[PDB]
Ligand binder design. Structure first.
Ligand SMILES: O=P(O)(O)O[C@H]1[C@H](O)[C@@H](OP(=O)(O)O)[C@@H](OP(=O)(O)O)[C@@H](OP(=O)(O)O)[C@H]1O
Length: 138
């Protein structure tokens, strides 16, 4: 809602990365979408136009399971996004794009696990940790 508390989305976190799923039926996978962490639920827009700008997916997924495995040797970042649900498990994995990428979602994703987003000072240590390897060697 929007009356006494929960005025707006206190925790703002958003970025654009690639996503690709095996799809249960067929679909097409491979899509550029910019999701954002609102008050306590997520939102998804593939085109601010959508004729009305209304997002296609909007719900509180949370429980995102993150697996950190990024070898800087070839500057290869590989984070798999898994989420348990009633149907079973939504296997999802986003593609890499630049160190600035892992810092935004890899951290938020982790936080998003405890339910909150990068609104915790702890996340600082998560992003401050990755960029630390760059200082050591590109
Ligand atoms: O537009 P089409 O070709 O139908 O495909 C989309 C994409 O698969 C979306 O992927 P992403 O999750 O990266 O946004 C999402 O898949 P999922 O269904 O697995 O969530 C949409 O869910 P639906 O719009 O609810 O069908 C699906 O419709």
């Amino acid at each position: 809602g929007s009356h006494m508390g929960d005025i707006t989305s206190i925790p703002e976190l958003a970025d654009y990365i690639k996503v690709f799923k095996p799809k249960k039926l067929t679909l097409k996978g491979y899509k550029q979408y910019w999701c954002t962490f609102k008050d306590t639920s997520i939102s998804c827009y593939k085109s601010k136009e959508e004729s009305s700008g209304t997002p296609a997916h909007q719900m509180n997924l949370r429980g995102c399971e993150v697996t950190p495995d990024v070898n800087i040797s070839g500057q290869k970042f590989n984070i798999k996004l898994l989420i348990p649900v009633a149907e079973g498990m939504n296997e999802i994995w986003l593609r890499c794009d630049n160190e600035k990428q892992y810092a935004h979602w890899m951290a938020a994703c982790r936080l998003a696990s405890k339910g909150k987003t990068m609104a915790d000072s702890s996340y600082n240590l998560e992003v401050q940790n990755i960029l630390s390897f760059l200082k050591m060697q590109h």
